[PDB]
RNA sequence: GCUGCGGUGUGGAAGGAGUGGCUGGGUUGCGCAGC
Ligand code: IRI
Ligand code: IRI
Ligand code: IRI
């Protein structure tokens with residue numbers, strides 16, 4: 702899971 | 716690789732899903748969960 706580790710709205714970027 | 720829950724806070728009890736996010740923690744951190 703090399704991608705978004707946290708979702709829902711705008712959580713999890715960088 | 717994608718997605719969901721203001722669920723977390725060195726403010727988190729007057730808030731939210733960033734319609735404050737070049738105003739910070741934080742290039743949306745942390746936790747939990749699902750495909
Ligand atoms: N969960 Ir309380 N954050 N710890 N609301 N009880 N203060
Ligand atoms: N400038 Ir800033 N926005 N505060 N360090 N990049 N995070
Ligand atoms: N501007 Ir900012 N919000 N502080 N993107 N660098 N993290």
Ligand SMILES: [K+]
Nearest residue numbers: 727730739740
């Ligand atoms: K805040």
